[PDB]
C-alpha cells in the first residue's frame, strides 16, 4: 500500500547545490538537548529534542541510535528517522547481517567498547584507537587515544538566548520539506592540519586549466544522470552563460556520498577518516564552499533531499587513507555468507583485464554480409586489423547494433555467419560470439532495461511476458501527473523513450525492480544470450537514462535544449532524463513495504539492476555459459556497494587532454569509494572537433590515452562511429588505424599483458582484503610532497600494492612533465622497452624533477626496489588473448634490485574463470616469494598461503643485476638438487628447449634466469652462491 509512512513529498525536481543550504538555518530543526534511552548490544539510543534554529521554542522529539560497528577498525554509526520508525534496509551496501557478523566476531575476541551513559546523560564509548563523547545536544568529539588529538568534531550554531544547537543532526521541518543534513567542523584552513577531502565517486573538478584529484572546498551532489561529456546543458547553474565545462557541481553516473578526510598529511600525527551518508535520494557533500552561499569555509556537511538519516564514520585500523578504504569495504563485506574468496568484491575472469574494442556503429559480423553504407564496418574487419597487426587483443564490446531493432536480448541475421538467427551450437551458422570464440576472443554486449514497447504488432517475448506477468512500472503517482501514453499500451504502464540520436530510437516499458518475481524474470532473459556464446555483460543507460521529456508532450518528443532553466523552471514537469520523479515505484530499499515516488530512491536504481543481473543472470544461469563459467558486469551506473556485482566504466567521455586528466582522477577516486575495477573509454567516446565531428583522435593524443590507461583496471577503446544510418561520431579510433604510432601503441598493450598477474593479484588483494588496486599518491605515508604530485601520480602492484609508480603525461603534444618520486625508497625507470635491456641506475625517492623528459614513445613508470613481480610471456612469442593463455605460457618471477637486502612478491593463481571453483569451493592458490641477500649468498624462498590450484607448467625466476652464479641449490618437498647452466643461449630457447633445473646468464638484459619445475612452486628454498 502506497506511501505507508504518510510522507508529504515536497520536492520532486533536481535541486542543484546552489539550492541546498543547511547553513541558512531557516525552517531547519537541529539537535537541542536529550536524555538517555538505553543500550542494547552495541547500540545506544538517545531521545533527542530537536529545536527549530530560527525559533527554538518549536521542538520535536526523535530517537537517535548511536552504534559501534567495529571496535578493531574504529568505526561507528549514527542513525534516525524523522518520518517514522527506524528501519533496516533489506538492500544496499550496509546490511545488518554483516554488522551482526562483525560484532559477533569482535565480541568473541573480548572487544569491549564500554558504551555507557554517564550520570549527566552524556554517551561515551571507545574503539581500539579512539574515544568518543557525545554531550546533551549531540555535540560530539572524537579523540585519538595515543596522542589525545581531537580528530573530528561536529558543528554547533548559537541562538539568541536558547543555547547552542548541534548541526551534526539536522532535518527540515516537515511543514516545509523533507531534507536532512549533518555538519562537521572543517579544518581545511588550519595552518597545521591543512585538511583535505577525497573520494566522491566520479566528480570532476577543474583548477585553472587542469583537472585535479582533491575535493576540498567544493559543493557536490550525487544524482545519477545520463551525463554525456560530463557537462550536460540541463545541469547548468542558474543563469549560466557560455560553455559549461565539466566541473565539481555537476552530478555524474555513480552515486558516492563518501569522503575521506586527511589531515596533518606526511607527519607522525596524520589522521584520516571516512564519512558515508548512506542515503539513495539526491545527496550532497560540501567541503567548505562559499559559492552560492552553499556552505562556509570552516564547515563541511553531507545531506540529502529525503530521509532517513544514516551515517557511518570510519577511521580504519592502521595509519593512512588506504586503511580507511579497507575498513569501509569490511562494513560492506560478505564474510557473513562465508565467502571463501569474494569477501569485499567479486573476482572477474582473468579476461576482464584484456584490451577490448567497442564500436557504436558496426552493421554486421562478416564483411560478406555487411550492408553497403558510407563508413560501414564489420566486426570481422576490426578483428582482422588487430590480429593481422599482432595486437594483444581480448575481444569486443558489441553494441545495440547487433540487436533486432533495439529489442534487448535479441540478435539479427547480419550478426551470424550464415546471415540468419539460429539457436546456437551450429558449426555452419555461428553467432558473433561463437565466431569470436574461434578467433580466441571473448565478448561483452550492451544490455539495458528498456524493453521495446512499439513493436508494430510483431512478437517480442521479453516485452510480452513483462506485460502478461504485471512486472512493469505502472503510471501511478500521488500528484495525478500524466506521464503520457501510446497506442501500444498497456493503459497503466509507465512508458518512456530511448534515444541514441540520429533516429536510433524507441518506446519502452521498464521493470519495477522492487516487485517480487522481477529479479528472477530479468536474470532468466540472459539465457537467450549466454546459450549463443555471450561471455560477459556491459550494463548501460542504467539511471534508467530516458530521453528528456516534459509532461503534456508526446512520448517521443523532447523539450527545447534550453529548457528547463532559471527563468523557466521545470516546476514538476521535467523527467530529468529518467523516470518522471513522481512515478510510484515498488520500494527498492525495503522489501514488502509498498510503493514510493522514485524521487526518494533515484540513486539505487542502477545498483538494483546490476544486483539482479549478477545474482539471477550470471550466477543462477551459470550452466548456460559456454566457454567461461565465471562472468562479469561492467556497468555505467550504480551506488556504493556495486563492487559486489562487477566493475564500472565512466560513461561517455570525449577525446581531449582534459578527459585523460579526468580518467586518471576518476580511477583513483572510484578506487577509494570501494569500486576498484573501473576505466574510461580509451581515446574518448564522443566526437571532439567542433568544425567537423568526424575527425578521429590524433595519433599523439591516442598514444597518451593508451599510455595513461594501460595499467588501469579496465582497458577498452570504445567510440561513437559515424555511419550513414547513424550520422554522429568519428570515422575511426582502432589502434591499428594509426600506422605512425602503431609500434608504440602495440608495445604498451604488450607491457600491460606481461603484467596481467600484477593486475589479477591486485584484484585478489581487493576481493579478499579490500585493498584498492589503484592508490592515490597521498596513500603513501610519511611523505609531505605526495599531496602536490597527487593529480597525475598513482601507485599499484606487488606484495603491498605500492611497488609501481605511474606519472603519465596528461597533455597532447608534450614531451616533458614534472616528476615526483616518493621518499625513503629507491626507484627504477621501467616501461615496455625494459623487458629486453638492463635497468638504469637507481633514482632516489623524494627527488623532484622539473621538465623530466618523456618522448611520445615513453611513459613515466617506475618499479620500486624490493619488488618481485609475476610476469607472463607467450611460449611462441606471438601476442595472444589472455583467455587463450595456458600454464605452458611462462610465469616468471622478476626480482628487481633489493631494498635493504630484501625483496618480496605475491601471486594469485586459478583457472582464470573457466569454472567458478575458486569462489565456490576454494580452488585457488596464493604463492609468496622473498629474496634476501646475506653476504655472498642470496636466498629466494617460495611459500604458499594455500595451494589448491595446481599450476601446470614450469616457472622462472629472473634476477635483475645478477650474472654468473658459482652454484645454485634448490630445496623443496620434492627433495633437493643443484641446478646446471643451460645449453640454451636465448630466452625463446630457454622457454622452448631448456630443461627444468637449467639456469641462463642473460648478459643483454643483465639478468639471471632459472627454470624450475611446476612441483617446486608451492614451497622452495633457492640458494645462489
Ligand atoms: C551506452 O550507449 C551506447 F549504446 C551508445 O552511445 C554505448 O556505445 C555507450 O558507450 C553507452 O554509454
Coordinates of C-alpha atoms in Angstrom, one line a residue, residues 613-894:
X613 CA 21.9 -9.2 -13.3
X614 CA 24.6 -10.6 -11.1
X615 CA 22.6 -13.0 -8.8
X616 CA 19.8 -14.1 -11.2
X617 CA 21.6 -13.7 -14.5
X618 CA 25.2 -14.6 -14.1
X619 CA 25.1 -16.8 -11.0
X620 CA 21.7 -18.6 -11.3
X621 CA 22.1 -19.3 -15.0
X622 CA 25.9 -20.1 -14.9
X623 CA 25.1 -23.5 -16.5
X624 CA 24.2 -21.8 -19.9
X625 CA 27.5 -20.1 -20.2
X626 CA 29.7 -21.7 -22.8
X627 CA 33.5 -21.1 -22.6
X628 CA 33.9 -19.4 -19.2
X629 CA 31.5 -20.3 -16.3
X630 CA 32.7 -17.2 -14.4
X631 CA 31.4 -13.9 -15.8
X632 CA 31.3 -10.2 -15.1
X633 CA 29.4 -6.9 -15.4
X634 CA 30.8 -3.6 -16.5
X635 CA 28.2 -1.0 -15.5
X636 CA 27.6 2.6 -16.4
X637 CA 25.8 3.5 -13.2
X638 CA 25.4 2.4 -9.5
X639 CA 25.8 3.2 -5.9
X640 CA 28.4 2.4 -3.1
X641 CA 28.3 -1.4 -2.9
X642 CA 28.5 -2.1 -6.8
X643 CA 31.9 -3.9 -6.4
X644 CA 29.9 -7.0 -5.4
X645 CA 28.2 -7.0 -8.8
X646 CA 31.1 -6.2 -11.0
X647 CA 33.1 -3.2 -12.2
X648 CA 32.5 0.2 -13.9
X649 CA 33.3 2.4 -16.9
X650 CA 32.9 6.2 -16.7
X651 CA 30.3 6.5 -19.4
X652 CA 30.5 8.9 -22.4
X653 CA 33.8 10.8 -22.2
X654 CA 35.4 12.7 -25.1
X655 CA 38.6 12.9 -27.0
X656 CA 40.7 15.7 -25.3
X657 CA 43.6 16.1 -22.9
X658 CA 41.2 17.2 -20.1
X659 CA 39.4 13.8 -20.4
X660 CA 42.6 12.0 -19.9
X661 CA 43.2 14.0 -16.7
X662 CA 39.7 13.2 -15.6
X663 CA 40.1 9.5 -16.5
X664 CA 43.1 9.2 -14.1
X665 CA 41.4 11.2 -11.3
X666 CA 38.2 9.2 -11.7
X667 CA 40.0 6.0 -11.4
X668 CA 41.9 6.9 -8.2
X669 CA 38.7 8.4 -6.6
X670 CA 36.5 5.4 -7.7
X671 CA 39.1 3.1 -6.2
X672 CA 38.8 4.8 -2.8
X673 CA 35.0 4.6 -2.9
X674 CA 35.5 0.8 -3.0
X675 CA 34.9 0.4 -6.7
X676 CA 38.4 -0.8 -8.0
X677 CA 37.6 -2.3 -11.4
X678 CA 36.9 0.8 -13.3
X679 CA 38.1 2.6 -16.5
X680 CA 37.1 5.1 -19.1
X681 CA 36.9 4.8 -22.9
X682 CA 40.5 4.9 -24.2
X683 CA 40.6 7.6 -26.9
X684 CA 37.3 9.2 -25.7
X685 CA 33.9 8.0 -26.7
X686 CA 32.3 11.2 -28.3
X687 CA 33.4 13.4 -31.3
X688 CA 35.6 16.4 -30.2
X689 CA 36.2 18.6 -33.3
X690 CA 33.6 21.3 -33.4
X691 CA 34.3 22.2 -37.1
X692 CA 33.9 18.5 -38.2
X693 CA 32.6 15.9 -35.8
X694 CA 34.1 13.1 -37.9
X695 CA 37.8 13.9 -37.2
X696 CA 39.5 11.0 -35.5
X697 CA 41.5 11.2 -32.3
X698 CA 45.1 12.4 -33.2
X699 CA 48.0 9.9 -33.1
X700 CA 49.6 11.8 -30.2
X701 CA 46.5 12.0 -28.1
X702 CA 45.8 8.3 -28.6
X703 CA 49.3 7.4 -27.6
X704 CA 48.8 9.4 -24.3
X705 CA 45.4 7.9 -23.8
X706 CA 46.8 4.4 -24.1
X707 CA 49.8 5.2 -22.0
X708 CA 47.6 6.7 -19.2
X709 CA 45.1 3.8 -19.3
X710 CA 47.5 0.8 -19.8
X711 CA 47.8 -0.1 -16.1
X712 CA 44.3 1.0 -15.2
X713 CA 42.0 -1.8 -14.2
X714 CA 39.5 -1.7 -17.2
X715 CA 41.1 -1.1 -20.6
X716 CA 38.8 -0.6 -23.5
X717 CA 39.0 1.6 -26.6
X718 CA 35.4 2.4 -27.5
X719 CA 33.8 5.2 -29.6
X720 CA 30.8 6.7 -31.4
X721 CA 31.4 5.9 -35.1
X722 CA 29.9 8.0 -37.8
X723 CA 28.0 5.8 -40.3
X724 CA 25.4 6.6 -43.0
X725 CA 22.5 5.3 -40.9
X726 CA 23.7 6.9 -37.6
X727 CA 25.3 10.1 -38.7
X728 CA 27.1 11.3 -35.5
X729 CA 30.6 10.2 -34.4
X730 CA 34.2 9.9 -35.6
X731 CA 35.4 8.0 -38.7
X732 CA 37.7 5.5 -36.8
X733 CA 39.6 5.0 -33.5
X734 CA 41.1 1.5 -33.6
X735 CA 44.9 1.2 -32.6
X736 CA 45.7 -0.5 -35.9
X737 CA 44.4 2.6 -37.8
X738 CA 47.4 4.6 -36.5
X739 CA 50.3 3.5 -38.8
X740 CA 52.7 6.1 -37.5
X741 CA 52.1 5.2 -33.9
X742 CA 51.4 1.5 -34.2
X743 CA 54.7 0.3 -32.8
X744 CA 54.2 2.4 -29.6
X745 CA 50.5 1.5 -29.3
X746 CA 51.3 -2.2 -29.7
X747 CA 54.2 -2.2 -27.1
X748 CA 52.1 -0.6 -24.3
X749 CA 49.4 -3.2 -24.9
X750 CA 52.1 -5.9 -24.7
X751 CA 53.5 -4.3 -21.5
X752 CA 50.1 -4.5 -19.9
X753 CA 49.8 -8.2 -21.0
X754 CA 53.0 -9.0 -19.4
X755 CA 51.8 -7.6 -16.1
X756 CA 48.4 -9.4 -16.3
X757 CA 49.3 -11.2 -13.0
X758 CA 50.1 -7.9 -11.3
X759 CA 46.5 -6.7 -12.1
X760 CA 44.9 -10.0 -11.4
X761 CA 46.7 -10.3 -8.0
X762 CA 45.8 -6.8 -7.0
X763 CA 42.2 -7.8 -7.9
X764 CA 42.5 -10.7 -5.4
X765 CA 44.0 -8.3 -2.8
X766 CA 40.7 -6.4 -3.3
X767 CA 38.2 -9.4 -3.2
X768 CA 40.0 -10.7 -0.2
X769 CA 41.3 -7.7 1.9
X770 CA 39.5 -4.7 0.3
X771 CA 42.8 -3.1 -0.8
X772 CA 42.3 -0.6 -3.7
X773 CA 44.0 -1.6 -6.9
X774 CA 45.0 1.9 -7.7
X775 CA 46.5 4.1 -4.9
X776 CA 46.2 7.9 -4.6
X777 CA 49.6 9.4 -4.0
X778 CA 48.5 10.6 -0.6
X779 CA 48.0 6.9 0.4
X780 CA 51.8 6.8 0.5
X781 CA 52.6 7.7 4.2
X782 CA 55.4 9.8 5.7
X783 CA 55.7 12.0 2.6
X784 CA 54.9 15.7 2.7
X785 CA 55.3 16.1 -1.1
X786 CA 52.9 13.4 -2.4
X787 CA 49.9 15.7 -2.0
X788 CA 51.2 18.2 -4.6
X789 CA 52.0 15.3 -7.1
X790 CA 48.6 13.7 -6.5
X791 CA 46.7 14.8 -9.6
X792 CA 48.6 12.6 -12.0
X793 CA 50.8 10.2 -9.9
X794 CA 49.5 6.9 -8.7
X795 CA 50.8 3.6 -7.4
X796 CA 49.9 -0.1 -7.7
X797 CA 51.1 -3.6 -7.7
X798 CA 53.4 -6.0 -5.8
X799 CA 53.1 -7.5 -2.4
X800 CA 51.9 -4.3 -0.6
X801 CA 50.2 -2.6 -3.6
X802 CA 52.8 0.2 -3.7
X803 CA 55.5 -1.3 -5.9
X804 CA 54.8 0.5 -9.2
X805 CA 54.6 4.3 -9.6
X806 CA 52.9 5.8 -12.7
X807 CA 53.0 9.5 -13.8
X808 CA 51.5 9.6 -17.3
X809 CA 51.8 12.7 -19.5
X810 CA 48.3 14.3 -19.5
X811 CA 48.7 16.9 -22.3
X812 CA 48.8 16.5 -26.1
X813 CA 52.0 17.5 -27.9
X814 CA 54.1 17.4 -24.8
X815 CA 57.4 15.6 -24.2
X816 CA 58.2 16.6 -20.5
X817 CA 56.4 16.6 -17.1
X818 CA 57.2 17.4 -13.5
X819 CA 58.1 14.2 -11.8
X820 CA 57.9 13.4 -8.1
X821 CA 59.4 10.3 -6.5
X822 CA 58.1 9.3 -3.1
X823 CA 60.7 9.5 -0.4
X824 CA 62.5 6.8 1.7
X825 CA 62.7 4.3 -1.2
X826 CA 64.7 3.9 -4.4
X827 CA 63.1 3.8 -7.9
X828 CA 64.0 2.2 -11.3
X829 CA 62.7 3.5 -14.6
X830 CA 60.7 0.8 -16.4
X831 CA 58.1 0.5 -19.2
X832 CA 57.7 -1.5 -22.4
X833 CA 61.4 -1.2 -23.5
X834 CA 63.0 -2.5 -20.3
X835 CA 61.9 -6.1 -20.7
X836 CA 64.7 -6.5 -23.3
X837 CA 67.5 -4.3 -21.9
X838 CA 69.1 -3.7 -18.5
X839 CA 67.7 -1.4 -15.8
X840 CA 69.3 2.1 -15.5
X841 CA 70.7 3.4 -12.2
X842 CA 68.6 3.8 -9.1
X843 CA 66.6 7.0 -8.7
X844 CA 66.5 8.5 -5.2
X845 CA 62.9 8.9 -3.8
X846 CA 61.9 12.4 -2.6
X847 CA 63.5 13.8 -5.8
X848 CA 61.5 16.4 -7.7
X849 CA 62.4 16.7 -11.4
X850 CA 61.1 19.7 -13.3
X851 CA 60.7 19.0 -17.0
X852 CA 61.5 15.3 -16.8
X853 CA 61.9 14.1 -20.4
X854 CA 59.1 12.0 -21.9
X855 CA 59.2 11.2 -25.6
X856 CA 55.9 10.2 -27.2
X857 CA 57.2 6.6 -27.2
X858 CA 57.7 6.6 -23.4
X859 CA 55.6 7.0 -20.4
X860 CA 56.8 7.6 -16.7
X861 CA 56.6 4.3 -14.8
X862 CA 58.9 3.2 -12.1
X863 CA 59.4 -0.1 -10.2
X864 CA 60.2 0.3 -6.5
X865 CA 63.2 -1.5 -5.1
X866 CA 62.3 -4.7 -3.2
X867 CA 59.7 -5.7 -5.7
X868 CA 59.3 -9.2 -7.1
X869 CA 56.6 -9.2 -9.8
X870 CA 54.8 -12.1 -11.6
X871 CA 55.2 -11.6 -15.3
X872 CA 53.8 -13.6 -18.3
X873 CA 55.1 -14.5 -21.8
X874 CA 53.6 -16.4 -24.6
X875 CA 55.5 -19.6 -25.3
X876 CA 55.6 -19.0 -29.1
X877 CA 56.4 -15.2 -28.8
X878 CA 53.2 -14.1 -30.7
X879 CA 50.7 -11.8 -29.0
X880 CA 47.6 -13.6 -27.9
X881 CA 44.5 -13.0 -25.8
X882 CA 44.6 -13.6 -22.0
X883 CA 41.8 -16.0 -22.3
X884 CA 43.9 -18.4 -24.5
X885 CA 47.0 -18.5 -22.2
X886 CA 47.6 -21.9 -20.6
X887 CA 50.1 -22.7 -17.8
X888 CA 52.6 -23.6 -20.6
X889 CA 52.9 -19.9 -21.3
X890 CA 55.7 -19.0 -18.9
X891 CA 55.1 -17.5 -15.4
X892 CA 58.3 -15.6 -14.4
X893 CA 59.0 -14.0 -11.1
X894 CA 61.1 -10.9 -11.8

